Amino acid sequence: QFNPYGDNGGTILGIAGEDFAVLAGDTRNITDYSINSRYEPKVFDCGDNIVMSANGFAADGDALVKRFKNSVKWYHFDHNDKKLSINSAARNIQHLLYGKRFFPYYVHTII
Amino acid sequence: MTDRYSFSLTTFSPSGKLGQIDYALTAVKQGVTSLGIKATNGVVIATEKKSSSPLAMSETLSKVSLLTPDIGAVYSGMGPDYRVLVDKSRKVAHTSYKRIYGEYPPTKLLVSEVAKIMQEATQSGGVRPFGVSLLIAGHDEFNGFSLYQVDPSGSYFPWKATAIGKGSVAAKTFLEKRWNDELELEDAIHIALLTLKESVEGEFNGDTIELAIIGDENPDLLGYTGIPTDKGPRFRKLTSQEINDRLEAL
Amino acid sequence: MDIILGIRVQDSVILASSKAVTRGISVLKDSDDKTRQLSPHTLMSFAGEAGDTVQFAEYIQANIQLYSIREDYELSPQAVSSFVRQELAKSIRSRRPYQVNVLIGGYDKKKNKPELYQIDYLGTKVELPYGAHGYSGFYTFSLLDHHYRPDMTTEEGLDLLKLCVQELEKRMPMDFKGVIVKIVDKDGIRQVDDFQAQ
Amino acid sequence: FRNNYDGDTVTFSPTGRLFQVEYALEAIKQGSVTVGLRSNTHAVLVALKRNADELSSYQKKIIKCDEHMGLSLAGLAPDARVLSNYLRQQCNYSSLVFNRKLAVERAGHLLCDKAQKNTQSYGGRPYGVGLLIIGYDKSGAHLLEFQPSGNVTELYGTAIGARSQGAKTYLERTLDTFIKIDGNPDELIKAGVEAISQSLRDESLTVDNLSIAIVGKDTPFTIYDGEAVAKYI
Amino acid sequence: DRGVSTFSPEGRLFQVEYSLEAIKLGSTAIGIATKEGVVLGVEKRATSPLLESDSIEKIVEIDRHIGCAMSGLTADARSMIEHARTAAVTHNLYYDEDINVESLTQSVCDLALRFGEGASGEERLMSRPFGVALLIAGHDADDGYQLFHAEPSGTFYRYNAKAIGSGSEGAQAELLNEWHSSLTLKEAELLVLKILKQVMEEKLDENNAQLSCITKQDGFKIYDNEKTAELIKELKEKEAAE
Amino acid sequence: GTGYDLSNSVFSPDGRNFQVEYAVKAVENGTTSIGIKCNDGVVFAVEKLITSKLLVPQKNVKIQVVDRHIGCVYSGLIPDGRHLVNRGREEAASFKKLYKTPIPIPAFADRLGQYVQAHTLYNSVRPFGVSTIFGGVDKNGAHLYMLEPSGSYWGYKGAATGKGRQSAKAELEKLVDHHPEGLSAREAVKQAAKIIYLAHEDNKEKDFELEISWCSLSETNGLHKFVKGDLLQEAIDFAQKEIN
Amino acid sequence: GSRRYDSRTTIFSPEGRLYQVEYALESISHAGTAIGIMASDGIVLAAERKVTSTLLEQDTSTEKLYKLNDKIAVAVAGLTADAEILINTARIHAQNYLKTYNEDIPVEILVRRLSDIKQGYTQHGGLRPFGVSFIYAGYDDRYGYQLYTSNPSGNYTGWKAISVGANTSAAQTLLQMDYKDDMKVDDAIELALKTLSKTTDSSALTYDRLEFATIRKGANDGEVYQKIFKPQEIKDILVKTGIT
Amino acid sequence: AGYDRHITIFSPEGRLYQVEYAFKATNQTNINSLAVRGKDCTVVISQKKVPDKLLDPTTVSYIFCISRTIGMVVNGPIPDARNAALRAKAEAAEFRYKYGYDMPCDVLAKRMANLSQIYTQRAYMRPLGVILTFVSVDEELGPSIYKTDPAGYYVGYKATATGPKQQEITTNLENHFKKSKIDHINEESWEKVVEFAITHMIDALGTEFSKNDLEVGVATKDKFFTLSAENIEERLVAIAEQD
Amino acid sequence: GYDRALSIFSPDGHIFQVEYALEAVKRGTCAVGVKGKNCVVLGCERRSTLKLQDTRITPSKVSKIDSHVVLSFSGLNADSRILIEKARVEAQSHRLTLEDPVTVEYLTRYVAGVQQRYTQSGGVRPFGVSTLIAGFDPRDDEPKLYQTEPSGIYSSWSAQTIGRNSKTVREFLEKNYDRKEPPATVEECVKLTVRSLLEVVQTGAKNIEITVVKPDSDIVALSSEEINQYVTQIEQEKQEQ
């Protein structure tokens, strides 16, 4: 039978300083015991000073990031270029994710 | 696109008349005369095949149609409206009855069904009433023989004898004289031919007269044998030749 | 499952319903009232699937009350039950059927007689002197079969019931935390607030 | 005459006209003026925002459809909102699905096709707003003029609205001059404001009144309002 | 007949224009935007002394930072309010923040032209335009105190002050002189209360007129009669003082 | 009575559909465009009115290609033309998707034909405000067509429509008699450049821009291409020469 | 578009009346008269067959008295066909109720349901109302014998005796004159016939032009029974009442 | 009130004007045609008139090939004719798929007539201004001619004519059959039937035809085809040597 | 599929269908309602165009939406039925999801919304009805009286009337209803109601019906005589002067 999911490994880490924050991640992408790429960025800059990464199943991870970035773009459109506060981005992300509650984005995301 | 005519095209006028029903009836009064006579052991319906050209093949156009093996119809008014009503009638005869009870509908019900179809074209959105009136004749086991008339309004009534179209008034009158409750089928067919002769201008023979009856069961027309309860249709359309033989003794 | 008992005496219907509500490992409540009042003279007790149980009962109640307001009349118990059967009979062939069993006890102000109706989630209705759903019948039917008489007074019914509840508390594997009894008669529905030691 | 052929867009006049549309085209000239012009490196939109009362805002007339495309409206605000929004999606679709910035020439095609549908089917109504679309794509700077009739045309410059013909003449002359203001946005804008004034008469473009937008080679479509445009008055 | 979304030879939409007429017949409503808050005032205008005057709701809360006044066919605004309240709450659910005043307004105006008999562009079912105008006032961190006027046209304007209703053109010109970028809430309150008094048919008391405002600190509040009563008095005095 | 010309699908007492005829009026009021069928293909050309100097030269293209081998040009309500092409393109994709082979010109014409005819059956829609000259090369030869708002269409040796439609037709009839053996791709290109220059007289008040395209089994490999640069300028000269 | 031919069957007159309803009501006035009289021990329905012939088969006929249930029957005035549509849906409602509650549908509940349908065609749909008025004669164990009436408007009311169709005014007066609460079915039958006999527009009043029905509770039984008189039975009851 | 002439509702006289005017449109082309039945074939002649010189003569036809067996000629505007032609081809293809045998000429006519009957009753659909003549050599009935109009009426003929000069052709034919006493051309080859057809077409219209003034279709057992200019010419030359 | 805009604006800014709907209300029989200090009373008149009715069954003017709220109306009867049903359902629905019966203001706000919706939806005409809704919010004793009209507008009154000659009877109430001292008695409240109705009913013992609503679902309708005794003592207050 067809399995819609996969695991591309990798690991990420986010640490919030006092007047800064960092989000890092290895750049390896794998499938089973093979290496797909030794360099495939996983942490992204989405604008409004927000960095996000969706680790897990790369296809789902990309869809989410792409969908969120585009979410930001429309925020500016629908709200007079207002800056998307991180707390607001998060709430937004929650809805993005829960929207597929019955066919989940197989990723653990951090911003 | 999309039928945007979702409102009635037949409405009430101040005098309380339903224009279209009326006009349709008018269109019917212009149709070629057709009649029906009920005897004690049968029913006869007949009309005139008004060939719209001598090049046309009168046969390739029946005004007398079989709805069920025991029910026949005929009309006066717009031929095309009649033809589609016949298809709808034959179909509903199956969908709303045969495919449920395993037997053909009884005359009154089938008639009732056709009448429903017509009623709708009188109130549904974006349509005009049928421009015809039919005379349906049939026979069912618990009601025997019957003859009904159906109007564009959707109204229908049972008759002993009656005529519709062009010379209906004259014909109805001639029928009231000759009709009695002890008539035999042949007697009726005779009366039928006579009444029709008045409404016929040109040639009057079995090639210009379409006539069919509802009488005994016709095993010879069933097409198979081995089922005692299946004896054949009570609806038989007369042949050009059969008409003439009775015209000689007119 | 929960206990759902019913007995039709001379001039009333008695409904005994367990008070326990277990959810997995613990007993969340010991005072659950597994019943709804459909009309001033009709009562329905119910037992079954976690959510369906109350939802169905409340759905049925809302409909009877609406009918009462519209016609300013109280449907007969017989009618109310036929309505309820049909609702269950539909639910049975739907995507997700209601898993509820019910007992409908009412006093027909017109025939001036009490009536007890038993209906399972399949839409199986039957009228009886006394009834029970699920396993309850197994422990109490031999008792009722024995001691039942159509002319029992309401007091005689509560005694026969009390006997049944004791047998249930003895031979049945689970602690259903006692019952709550209710009487439906020519004067409405009242609750026997004292069955903890009658 | 007209009285019987202007009841809805689905009807042709005996001469072959579509009054409902022409009537639409009219809501345009009744709107405030706006101007557009481009060099080989930039395209500018100078729009005159209009106020209802002296206590009202001067309604926004420039909308950003993407990082490389935007337009100015003249006529029914709601309609521009609809059309610009649709243009925002078509741009978005192109980027998302093909990772390709949408061609300004193609945006025109789209808009044209959208407006056309509202001129052949019963029950609808033509859009009552004119639009000027500028953008810098893979083939340089672009300026487009959209008319509710569904007519889009590419130009070096133009203007629409009340007294539009004023600035339109100015530009038709100042052409050989501005089509060469490459490398200097400040000048193109100054020229865009010198054209928009060619259609003044009432007042004189003030700070909170004026509105300008620009896009080009190394400049993402951006809107300048108020004090931001002060250095142009 | 003629389409409900037809254009006049001058390029106007009949249904919208005729709409604007019904509105001119509504009870007067005024709003003033100061740097200390926005004031909204309306003319109750009961049609009989038997009608309980406080059951006349023409000033409603959209959210704690947004409120609005209506003028014209008031029943027509019920769904507009519902939609507005829903948009503000929804925006909050999705973004954990306050919907910007302009956005709430723009959202409301999107319904405006959603009328017709099968207009090509989506599915705009609504036989006619709303017969009511709205003054939406509120505050948000990006543009502070704001006052908006929403029409059935679908377009909306921002004003420093604005009056809609029967005495609109009159009261407006009045505002033209009275308004300045340094007004204080107290001043605006009195001012609104004053113009109402001029354009109103009845003698303005605290039972046929209603005030309210919206400040960053306490949000949108509707002044109870007693609080208004004294503002009426405070008005009478400062006028009888010259 | 009257009113027979207010609704679309309404037959007037003499059997005409006035709304369609009124549509034709918008067609005549438009720019002229033509088509010339040569010995192995077709050429399309259209007049473009220069409202002013602000119009970027060569930009606002008007001829459209359907699929890879069909060329379309129309006169009248430009937007209505595009719409028809859009439908044409869909109709063509559908056909190639099921049959693999790209859509034959005759077939493509009926597709456009049936669709246009359709807009004359209900009063809920307006007829097409354009005439379309289109064609291309297929399994068996070249084909040229012209479609009327009534949805009517036929195959042509040459075709023209728009403001200067009569000048053209005349010029075309000439070419037809003087070349019973069939003109050539190369020839038709200039020839067309001429006929537009002449036909432009009925509009000599405004300056214009010529646009030509062609589809030739031998000159373009059966694909529809635009005449640009040299070959274009060469035929513009040939015109400016015989116009005097 | 289509808006042109729309009669707008559901709008208010400047006076606040419903055009189509009023006109339907007018149509109804030209219909054969029907009478309903309720006694202490029963209900009587009588109606005059509009237009007949010598050849009209009367035994096999029914155009004014219809059986909806075993306890509810109606007398029709207006469009026969329109009535049949309503009648059938009425019969369905009755059976749905029976299946749902296992009790016969209470007369008023059925009358309301049907009136609500009529009222619908009054407020939306752009369709014409049904040209029909009904007199409902039924019995239920809550109000016993009942008599109702409904018209195109969708309004209904209860009566001791009432009429619909032609000359309602004249009939309503004759009934209001000889009617008495403590009546008896036999008494009502007689009054019914007299009333029609004096409000006809035809020569005399023969059986062949009548339909008769009664809902009694036949003492020797304890239950309700509907009786649609046969031609011969109407002929009889006609001689005894002294109308030969 | 005057709208009872724009849509297909009844006129107070019980008439349908739109249907009438539609009949009018059938002559808009000013073309006459006729069909006759052979001993085992069916032929239909129709005038071919090409005004514009810029037209490609080969594409100007009003004769259609509905199925391998059914042929149809249309009297009326080309767009409506083509609309009717497409639908008919579709209907005939589907019938085969669903019922396992070739759709009979008469049935197809009935089907097309029923569809027209509808535009006659439903208000949003306008009638098609055309008259359709279907011909073939039905496997059960033999040579057949069935024609339908905008009224939704249809019937079978021994022979028939349609167009502005319908009456002359009809009476011309009417005559020939009163004389021959049979209901068909008693010829063996369709070629002579086509010749008889063209001959009478001439007597009635009183006109001479060249190989490009006519259009001919022939239906035979299992096939319906249309002659070419040259096929026609060969026909014209034959009737020359006789007159 | 019918969606023709029947309620639309006219040049002067009016919506004639809503306008004409009101006209249908005027034509309807008079209805009145007055609130006391511990009750609300609803009075309605009975036409006499035709009298030979069956008072038992024939539908009566005051209807219960719930055990604690009633609704009376003026205008097209058939239309009033639709609104009533819709209200009775929304009543049961509200009890079902909020676990508390509707307030009078709510139930009213609902009905009004329904009427309003019908003023701007395609293929539908407005309700030719106006209504008076009265009752007591659950667990409250303060009486409530509201009124709605075709336009969809609603509000509360101390006393109000709708229908024919409502113009008249309203005046009576305006100079006979003191807010300072509303009918402190169920009796003196029903009287004040009868009085107002007599200004228009013109001798109609059988042409006047009164329904009294008290706190906690106490709703009763008077009988001919009970009212007959009120009418009687009122024509004595007049005669003794």
For residue G191, what is the domain's CATH number? Answer: 3.60.20.10
Count structural domains, chain G.
1
Neighbours of D30 (CB within 10 A): 15
The pair of three-digit structure tokens given for residue A51, joined into one six-digit string: 């960095």
The four Cα atoms F78, F84, F86, F88 give a dihedral, to 10 degrees, of -140
Residue spans of alpha helices (H) in chain H: 17-25, 78-99, 105-119, 166-180, 190-205, 229-240
H/E stretch holding I154: strand I154-156
Domains and CATH numbers, chain D: 1-233 (3.60.20.10)
Do residues D91 and D99 touch, judged by C-beta distance below 8 A? no
Chain C: residue whose CA lies nearest to I94: C62
CB–CB contacts below 8 A, G to H:
8
Residue spans of alpha helices (H) in E31-100: 78-95
| A24 vs H25: CA distance, rounded Å | 79
Of G100, G141, G142, Cβ closest to residue C82? G100
Residues of chain H positioned with their CB less than 8 A from the CB of G2? 123-124
User: Which of A62, A65, A73 to mutate against chain D (most D CBs within 10 Å)?
Assistant: A73
For residue D121, the cross-strand partners are F125
Residues of chain B positioned with their CB less than 8 A from the CB of G17? none
Chain G residues contacting C, CB < 8 Å? Answer: 99-103, 106, 109, 141-142
Is I203 near chain C, with CB under 8 Å? no
Chain G: residue whose CA lies nearest to B3: G2
Interface E:I, ≥3 CB–CB pairs < 8 Å:
yes
Q: What length does chain A have? A: 111
- Give the chains touching G; criterion: ≥3 Cβ pairs < 8 Å: B, C, D, E, F, H, I
- Give the chains touching C; criterion: ≥3 Cβ pairs < 8 Å: G, I
H206 CB-near residues (< 8 Å, 6+ apart): none
| E128 vs E107: CA distance, rounded Å | 19
**Sign, CA torsion H60/H64/H65/H66:** positive
CB-count exposure of residue E210 (10 Å: 0-12, 13-18, 19+): buried
Q: Which residue has the tokens 């008007």?
A: F62
Chain D residues contacting E, CB < 8 Å? Answer: 2, 6-8, 19-20, 23-30, 52-57, 59, 75-78, 81-82, 117-118, 121-126, 128
Do residues B232 and B220 touch, judged by C-beta distance below 8 A? yes
Of H10, H106, H114, Cβ closest to residue B27? H10
Interface F:H, ≥3 CB–CB pairs < 8 Å:
yes
Is H140 near chain B, with CB under 8 Å? no
Do residues F193 and F212 touch, judged by C-beta distance below 8 A? yes
| C64 vs C81: CA distance, rounded Å | 11
Q: What is the DSSP string of C85-146?
A: HHHHHHHTTSSS---EEEEEEEEETTTTEEEEEEE-TT--EEE-SEEE-TTHHHHHHHHHHH
Chain D: residue whose CA lies nearest to E112: D78
- Give the chains touching I; criterion: ≥3 Cβ pairs < 8 Å: B, C, E, G
User: Which of F2, F115, F121, F195 to mutate against chain H (most H CBs within 10 Å)?
Assistant: F121
- Return residues 118-137 of E near D (CB < 8 Å): 118-121
Is F101 near chain G, with CB under 8 Å? no
| B93 vs B75: CA distance, rounded Å | 18
**I113 alpha carbon, distance to own chain's centre:** 17
Of E4, E21, E56, Cβ closest to residue I8? E4
Question: Does the beta-carbon distance from F125 to D120 stay under 8 Å?
Answer: yes
- Return residues 1-60 of G near E (CB < 8 Å): 1, 3-4, 6
Geometric angle at alpha carbon F118, from F117 and F122, rounded to 5°: 120
User: Which of I2, I3, I125 to mutate against chain B (most B CBs within 10 Å)?
Assistant: I2
Question: Does the beta-carbon distance from E1 to G3 stay under 8 Å?
Answer: yes
Is F7 near chain G, with CB under 8 Å? yes
| G220 vs F105: CA distance, rounded Å | 89
Look up residue C123 and give its amino acid.
Answer: G
Residues of chain F positioned with their CB less than 8 A from the CB of H127? 11
CA distance E75 to chain I (A): 5
> CA I21 → CA E131, E176, G13, distances in Å?
17, 41, 9
Domain extent listing, chain F:
1-244
Is D11 near chain F, with CB under 8 Å? yes
**Sign, CA torsion F38/F44/F47/F50:** negative
CB–CB contacts below 8 A, D to E:
99
Is D64 near chain A, with CB under 8 Å? yes
| G87 vs G68: CA distance, rounded Å | 7
Residues of chain I positioned with their CB less than 8 A from the CB of E14? 9
Interface I:B, ≥3 CB–CB pairs < 8 Å:
yes
**Is-catalytic flag, F161?**
no
User: Which of C39, C71, C109 to mutate against chain G (most G CBs within 10 Å)?
Assistant: C71
Question: Does the beta-carbon distance from C69 to I92 stay under 8 Å?
Answer: yes
Closest by alpha carbon to I183, among I204, I154, I214?
I214
Domains and CATH numbers, chain E: 1-242 (3.60.20.10)
8-state DSSP, F201: G
For residue F125, the cross-strand partners are D121
CA distance H33 to chain F (A): 20
Look at strands G210-216 and G225-228 and give their pairing: antiparallel
- Give the chains touching H; criterion: ≥3 Cβ pairs < 8 Å: B, F, G
Is B84 near chain H, with CB under 8 Å? yes
CB–CB contacts below 8 A, A to E:
24
Domains and CATH numbers, chain C: 1-198 (3.60.20.10)
Look up residue B92 and give its amino acid.
Answer: V
CA distance H156 to chain B (A): 6
3-state secondary structure of C181: strand
H/E stretch holding E69: strand E66-72
CB-count exposure of residue H168 (10 Å: 0-12, 13-18, 19+): middle
Geometric angle at alpha carbon B197, from B193 and B202, rounded to 5°: 135
The CATH number corresponding to F1-244 among 1.10.150.80, 3.90.550.10, 3.40.190.80, 3.60.20.10 equals 3.60.20.10
| E85 vs E83: CA distance, rounded Å | 6
- Return residues 105-164 of G near I (CB < 8 Å): 108, 112, 115-116, 118-119, 122-127, 143, 146-148, 153-162
Closest by alpha carbon to G189, among G28, G38, G69, G19?
G38
Residue numbers of the domain that contains I168: 1-241
E203 CB-near residues (< 8 Å, 6+ apart): none
Neighbours of B62 (CB within 10 A): 16
I95 CB-near residues (< 8 Å, 6+ apart): C62, C65, I66, I101, I102
CA distance D191 to chain A (A): 28
Residues of chain F positioned with their CB less than 8 A from the CB of D123? 124
For residue I26, what is the domain's CATH number? Answer: 3.60.20.10
Describe chain C by its helix, strand, coil percentages, rounded to 5.
35, 30, 35
| C60 vs C46: CA distance, rounded Å | 11
The pair of three-digit structure tokens given for residue E140, joined into one six-digit string: 């948000």
| Given resolution (angstroms) | 3.0
Residues of chain H positioned with their CB less than 8 A from the CB of B2? 124
Domains and CATH numbers, chain H: 1-243 (3.60.20.10)
| D233 vs B90: CA distance, rounded Å | 85
Closest by alpha carbon to H28, among F21, E44, I99, B13?
F21
D67 CB-near residues (< 8 Å, 6+ apart): D101, D220, D221
Count structural domains, chain I.
1
Do residues H130 and H77 touch, judged by C-beta distance below 8 A? yes
Question: Does the beta-carbon distance from G128 to B118 stay under 8 Å?
Answer: no
| G190 vs G209: CA distance, rounded Å | 16
For residue B90, what is the domain's CATH number? Answer: 3.60.20.10
Max CA pair span of chain G: 67
